[PDB]
Ligand binder design. Sequence first.
Ligand code: ZN
Ligand code: ZN
Length: 108
Amino acid sequence: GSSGSSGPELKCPVIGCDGQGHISGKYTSHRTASGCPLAAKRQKENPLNGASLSWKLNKQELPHCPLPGCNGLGHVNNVFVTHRSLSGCPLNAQVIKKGKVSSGPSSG
Ligand SMILES: [Zn+2]
Ligand SMILES: [Zn+2]
């Protein structure tokens, strides 16, 4: 090895993606959307494949919170870490406020 080599190259423009793998399968990597397997997995619905740690799991379920940003995790009483309702939603309680002078109707 007299010398090495370096240089930037294309990359998966699809945010959130890892860039690894290929919508074809043969290749275990990609740097474009056309070859992005993740971008295809979304548009399509093939739950065929899927591995999840299902064994000896007592607490296995998702919360029931209306708030989009809220991950149904937490509690107003500041005691637990879960909540499947508003009254319990800690992020919904603080928000509560009658008389919010500042009001921005504009929606972009
Ligand atoms: Zn990708
Ligand atoms: Zn919540």
